[model samples]
Target: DAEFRHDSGYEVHHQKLVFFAEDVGSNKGAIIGLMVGGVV
Candidate 1:
C-alpha cells in the first residue's frame, strides 16, 4: 500500500496492486505482459 499527494493537492492513500496467476503453466506470456504493462 502507498500514500502520496496528487497533483491537485488531494491526498491519495491505500493504493495497491495485486497480481494472480492461476494457470501460469499455460499463460506465462500473459502474466509477463501484465507485469510489464503494470510497471510501464
Candidate 2:
C-alpha cells in the first residue's frame, strides 16, 4: 500500500507492505510454521 500527501508546501510519500489473513492463511499450518521459524 502507498500514499502521497502534500502539506505545508511539502510533499510526502508513504509506502507499506500489508498482509491479509485470508491470503496468509492460504497454506494454513504450513504458512504459520514458516513464519514461526522466521522463514516467511
Candidate 3:
C-alpha cells in the first residue's frame, strides 16, 4: 500500500484497515461472497 502525504511532508493520512481471520472455511466463504458481490 502506498502512503499519502501533503506538500508540507506531513504524514497524516487515513490508514488502510484490514482484518485477518484464522478460520480457513470462513475465509473461503468470505472470499466467495466477495467474488459474487463483485460481479455487479
Candidate 4:
C-alpha cells in the first residue's frame, strides 16, 4: 500500500519505522525494564 521511485517495501517500511521510533520512546522501559521509565 506504498510506493517509491526505485525501491520496494523497504521505503514504506522505513517510513513505518520512523513512526514506530517516535512511539518507541513512550514504552521504551518495556524494552529496558531497568531505569523503569515509560511503562514502569
Candidate 5:
C-alpha cells in the first residue's frame, strides 16, 4: 500500500506501517498484527 520514488537524484525517506492479504485465509490474523503494531 505504498510507492517508492527512484528518480531525480536518489534519496532516503521515512517509514510506514502497512499490511495486506490476498485470496486466502481469514482477516483476524492480519487485524491482530496491525492492531499490535499500531499500538506499539
Candidate 6:
C-alpha cells in the first residue's frame, strides 16, 4: 500500500497484493483453514 498527500492536505492511497496464500490444491482444505482462522 502507498499513501500520498495532495496540495490541499487530502490523501490518496493504493492497495497491492491485498491477499495471498500458499495453494494446497484443494478447496475443502482451504475453506477449512479459513474457517479455523476465523474462529480462532
Candidate 1 per-residue lDDT, tens place, 11-37, comes to 567984545433435633453533334
Write the candidate numbers in order of decreasing TM-score: 3, 1, 6, 5, 2, 4
The lDDT values for all models are 0.48, 0.46, 0.46, 0.39, 0.52, 0.49
* Model 4 Cα lDDT, one tens digit per residue, 1-40: 4443443553434334322222334633433435545552
For residues 1-40, write the lDDT of model 6, one tens digit per residue.
Answer: 4554434466567953344445667655443534334453
**Ten residues in a row with the worst lDDT in model 4?**
15-24
Alpha-carbon runs more than 4 Å astray in model 2: 9-40
Candidates in order, TM-scores: namely: 0.19, 0.17, 0.19, 0.13, 0.18, 0.18
- lDDT leader: 5
Candidate 4 residue 14 Cα shift, in angstroms, is 23
Candidate 4 residue pairs in backbone clash = none
Could you give candidate 3's per-residue lDDT for residues 1-40 as a string of tens digits? 3554434555566784545444455423343434334452
- Separately for all candidates shown, the number of backbone clashes (residues 3 or more apart, or on different chains) is 0, 0, 0, 0, 0, 0
RMSD score of candidate 1 (Å): 15.2
lDDT (10s digit) by residue, model 2, range 12-36 = 5697354533344354344243334
Model 1: pairs clashing at backbone N, Cα or C within 3 Å:
none
lDDT of candidate 5?
0.52
